[PDB]
Amino acid sequence: FLKLKDIVGSEAFQDYVTDPRGLISKKDFQKAMDSQKQFTGPEIQFLLS
Amino acid sequence: QWDRLVLNTPSFPSNYWDKFVKRKVLDKHGDIFGRERIAELLGMDLAS
């Protein structure tokens, strides 16, 4: 939950956000985390949960 | 800014004896930027 704030600030995440309102998709958030290759699979699952 | 020209060049290390630079950099930064962005920047073909 410390790295989360960083990635949310990271433009890569803001880019992966296409929705104008800002809310990325559950499948799309999975992509943002996939890009940074920072959080591991189960970690991304927990973040989604 | 000028150096941005030799990165994709096939002979980037012509005088420097380290001929593994392109690979070293690719593998070290590859996970974060992917293996295709680094390959494009360094003009190296993974398919090759």
From Swiss-Prot, chain B:
This is Ryanodine receptor 1. Cytosolic calcium-activated calcium channel that mediates the release of Ca(2+) from the sarcoplasmic reticulum into the cytosol and thereby plays a key role in triggering muscle contraction following depolarization of T-tubules. Repeated very high-level exercise increases the open probability of the channel and leads to Ca(2+) leaking into the cytoplasm. Can also mediate the release of Ca(2+) from intracellular stores in neurons, and may thereby promote prolonged Ca(2+) signaling in the brain. Required for normal embryonic development of muscle fibers and skeletal muscle. Detected in muscle and myotubes (at protein level). Ubiquitous. Detected in diaphragm, skeletal muscle, esophagus, spleen, submaxillary gland, adrenal gland, cerebellum, brain and in testis germ cells. Disruption phenotype: Perinatal lethality, due to severe defects in skeletal muscle development. Neonates do not breathe and do not move. Mutant mice show defects in muscle fiber development. Their muscles do not show a contractile response to electrical stimulation. In addition, mice display abnormal curvature of the spine, thin limbs, and an abnormal rib cage. Channel activity is modulated by phosphorylation. The calcium release channel activity resides in the C-terminal region while the remaining part of the protein constitutes the 'foot' structure spanning the junctional gap between the sarcoplasmic reticulum (SR) and the T-tubule. Pore opening is mediated via the cytoplasmic calcium-binding domains that mediate a small rotation of the channel-forming transmembrane regions that then leads to channel opening. Homotetramer. Can also form heterotetramers with RYR2. Identified in a complex composed of RYR1, PDE4D, PKA, FKBP1A and protein phosphatase 1 (PP1). Repeated very high-level exercise decreases interaction with PDE4D and protein phosphatase 1 (PP1). Interacts with CALM; CALM with bound calcium inhibits the RYR1 channel activity. Interacts with S100A1. Interacts with FKBP1A; this stabilizes the closed conformation of the channel. Interacts with CACNA1S; interaction with CACNA1S is important for activation of the RYR1 channel. Interacts with CACNB1. Belongs to the ryanodine receptor (TC 1.A.3.1) family. RYR1 subfamily. The gene is Ryr1. Caffeine binds at W17. It is found in: Sarcoplasmic reticulum membrane.
